[PDB]
Amino acid sequence: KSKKGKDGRFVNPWPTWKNPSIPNVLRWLIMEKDHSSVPSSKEELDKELPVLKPYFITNPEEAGVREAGLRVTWLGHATVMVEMDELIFLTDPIFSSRASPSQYMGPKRFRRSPCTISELPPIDAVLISHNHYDHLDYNSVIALNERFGNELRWFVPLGLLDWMQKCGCENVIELDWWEENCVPGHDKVTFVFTPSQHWCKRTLMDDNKVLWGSWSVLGPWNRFFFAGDTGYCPAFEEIGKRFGPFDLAAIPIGAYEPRWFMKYQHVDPEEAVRIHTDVQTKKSMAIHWGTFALANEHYLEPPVKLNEALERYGLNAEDFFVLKHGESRYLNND
């Protein structure tokens, strides 16, 4: 084909090829995080947002997929564990309490992680959407690579290969817009890096030196889409048309407040439903939200707005569902 928007590299770094982006960010200190949600007592946090014990804790067996369907588990924020086509892979693993380079400041999760690395079953690959601290957790990478090793294939955007080896990972793969690879054992599955409308930053002056994006996993049996972080852009229609119908898609539905400031980097539930429609997935799972306070919206608002948008497009909760922390879901195909 050819009608695919490629990068997307200005003078030296990467801009979003997409027209909706505007260049102006003033970073995370506490300015619009504050407490505009006031997550109250951890008990209320429980009552409203209970943390479940994942299945693989009480029954570490049954953690295959036995081909056929597709199993998914939400481990908070953008951490998703997908079992499909004889393969278990993790996405944006964050297990630390705080998503920050310091121990003294930064957004600290109000919901504990459902499980620990030691407790999670054998991981065959990890997918990294972009490099932000709420998706790339140094300590989580350290734990993953200590437990596993060369056993773990890491799929990262351009610019993160160095960082990965710097951490101590040897099975690391840098991928660009519309670029693919697989796991050495399982070649029938293809992992494709697909565009997105977001940004990268971890330190001073490294802004967009690393790429952002989304992931499309094409196995023979099931197809899976993982958006990562994005505001609405026309790449999602492109992806949907190139990788056919998907069985699951993980779409962010949180951190969309100060829309005047975030719309260029963060969809809201309404644009999240549109994404679900654009990518042609049969089902979608609400990621982001509920775990960290990265914006101004009420911590329970994003599911309500998701249901309101789902009623906007003539859809039901079946099509686009929100899980509990640690809850799983099985989906068999035709």
Ligand X SMILES: CCCCCCCCCCCCCCCCCC(=O)OC[C@H](COP(=O)(O)OCCN)OC(=O)CCCCCCCCCCCCCCCCC
Q: Of 85, 92, 137, 229, which lies in the binding site for Zn ion, with binding defined by CB under 5 A? A: 229
Backbone angles phi, psi at 303, to 5 degrees: -60, -40
- 135 annotated binding-site participant: yes
Strands (E) located in the chain: 70-74, 80-84, 87-91, 125-127, 153-157, 172-175, 179-181, 190-194, 214-218, 223-226, 246-252, 281-287, 320-321, 328-331
Q: Who contacts 92 (Cβ-Cβ below 8 Å, separation ≥6)?
A: 77, 78, 79, 80, 127, 128, 129, 134, 135, 136, 228
Q: Of 143, 200, 235, 248, which lies in the binding site for ligand HCZ, with binding defined by CB under 6 A? A: 143
Answer yes or no whether residue 107 interacts with ligand X by CB under 6 A: yes
CA gap 233, 21 in Å, rounded: 9
In this structure, the number of other CB atoms found within 10 A of the CB of residue 167 comes to 16
- Binding segment for a second copy (CB under 8 A), chosen from 4-12, 112-120, 243-251, 307-315, is 112-120
Answer yes or no whether residue 263 interacts with ligand X by CB under 6 A: no
| Of residues 81-100, those binding a second copy (CB under 8 A) | 96-98, 100
Q: Of 2, 41, 59, 102, which lies in the binding site for ligand DXC, with binding defined by CB under 6 A? A: 102
Question: Judged by CB, which is closer to a second copy: 167, or 331?
Answer: 167
- Asked if 161 and 120 count as a contact pair (C-beta separation under 8 A), the reply is no
Strand ranges of the sheet holding 223-226, from the earlier edge strand across to the other edge: 179-181, 190-194, 214-218, 223-226, 246-252, 281-287, 320-321
Question: Judged by CB, which is closer to a second copy: 115, or 192?
Answer: 115
Please, what's the b/e burial string for 215-230 (b: 16 or more CB within 10 A of its CB; e: otherwise)?
bbbbbebbbbbbbbbb
Name the residue among 333, 310, 326, 246 with its Cα closest to residue 72: 326
- 255 annotated binding-site participant: no
Question: Judged by CB, which is closer to ligand DXC: 118, or 203?
Answer: 203
Residue the block writes with tokens 């351009």: 158
Answer yes or no whether residue 181 interacts with ligand HCZ by CB under 6 A: no
Answer yes or no whether residue 105 interacts with ligand DXC by CB under 6 A: yes
Which among a second copy, ligand DXC, ligand HCZ, none contacts residue 105 (Cβ within 5 to 8 A by kind)? ligand DXC
Which among ligand DXC, a second copy, ligand HCZ, none contacts residue 147 (Cβ within 5 to 8 A by kind)? a second copy
What six digits make up the tokens of 3?
Answer: 């009608």
- Binding segment for ligand HCZ (CB under 6 A), chosen from 76-84, 96-104, 150-158, 264-272, is 96-104
| Of residues 145-164, those binding a second copy (CB under 8 A) | 147
Q: Of 85, 92, 124, 134, which lies in the binding site for Zn ion, with binding defined by CB under 5 A? A: 134
Q: Of 163, 177, 199, 246, which lies in the binding site for ligand DXC, with binding defined by CB under 6 A? A: 163
- 205 annotated binding-site participant: yes
Residues that bind ligand HCZ (CB under 6 A): 95-98, 108, 116, 139-140, 143
Residues that bind a second copy (CB under 8 A): 42, 96-98, 100-104, 112, 116, 118, 138-139, 147
